[PDB]
Amino acid sequence: LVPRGSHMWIGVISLFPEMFKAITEFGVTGRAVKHNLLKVECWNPRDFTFDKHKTVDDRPYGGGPGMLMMVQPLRDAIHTAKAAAGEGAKVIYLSPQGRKLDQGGVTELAQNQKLILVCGRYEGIDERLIQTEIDEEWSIGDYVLTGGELPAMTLIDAVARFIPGVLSFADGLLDCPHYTRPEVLEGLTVPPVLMSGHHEEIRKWRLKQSLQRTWLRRPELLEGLALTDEQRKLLKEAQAEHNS
């Protein structure tokens, strides 16, 4: 009954599929799953092992302190996910060596109706599997985590927001400050304009604050933008008041 149509299917390859309950069972993403706007399906390489101890790691050629994902169980899990996905599924590997995710990249990834996310553990996966099985390698940021599961979940959450029905950044700026009750909090008052009921004055104040915040915190983000006439004016005003 809930209108889908732009529903999204996401296959996940992970040694710890139960981690994905954090997004499939709670909040907005949990609702998206319940309403069939989002489907997350997990395959565990451990289920594709054949030895008694269900071995899923293997030693790197050339030595070193780390292990890699064992090729055969991982490869078989990926092939099974691909078979379930059918035609048109893009296979994504999350790693610190990948293309850096930003909101633009999220909107690009969100254009896919089917994704398969491969979650590496240990020191990652065999380079030849990346060559033969992986379409795109992405990073959620310049830091190292214990597995690709949190990055995969982060990507799912980010793209889920663009699925119709699931739900100032949209303009490439940081957001303005927001206020709610009470009118006075530890001596700090709400900006009078927000309680004026003057919608146009409130819009312009918020936009001016967003411009000022972006300039002060992330000035490089401004360089990437072609500001509107109005934005140029409000930013100039904010900068003048800062130097005043």
Ligand X SMILES: CN(C)c1cccc(CNc2ccc(C(N)=O)cn2)c1
Q: Which is nearer to ligand X, 73 or 148 (CB)?
A: 148
Crossing angle of helices 149-160 and 27-34, rounded to 10°: 70
Q: How far is the CB of 50 from ligand X (least distance, A)?
A: 25
Q: How many residues does the chain have?
A: 244
Q: How far is the CB of 203 from ligand X (least distance, A)?
A: 16
Site for a copy of itself in 26-45 (CB under 8 A): 26-29
Binding string to a copy of itself for residues 175 to 204, with x set by CB under 8 A, is what?
Answer: x-xxxxxx--xx-x-x--xxx---x--x--
Binding residue for ligand X (CB under 6 A) from 18, 47, 102, 123? 123
Site for a copy of itself in 113-152 (CB under 8 A): 121, 123-124, 126-132, 140-147, 149-151
CB-based contact 175:209 (threshold 8 Å)? no
The reply to whether 54 sits near a copy of itself by the rule CB under 8 A is no
What are the Cα distances from residue 133, in Å, to 77, 122, 125, 200? 11, 19, 11, 52
* Binding partner of 179, given ligand X, a copy of itself, none, CB within 5-8 angstroms per partner class: a copy of itself
User: CA-to-CA distance for 78 and 129, rounded, in angstroms?
Assistant: 10
Q: How far is the CB of 118 from a copy of itself (least distance, A)?
A: 15
The reply to whether 141 sits near ligand X by the rule CB under 6 A is yes
CB-based contact 118:148 (threshold 8 Å)? yes
- Could you tell me the two tokens for 235? 């930013």
CB-based contact 179:191 (threshold 8 Å)? yes
Known binding-site residue numbers for S-adenosyl-L-methionine: 93, 120, 140-145
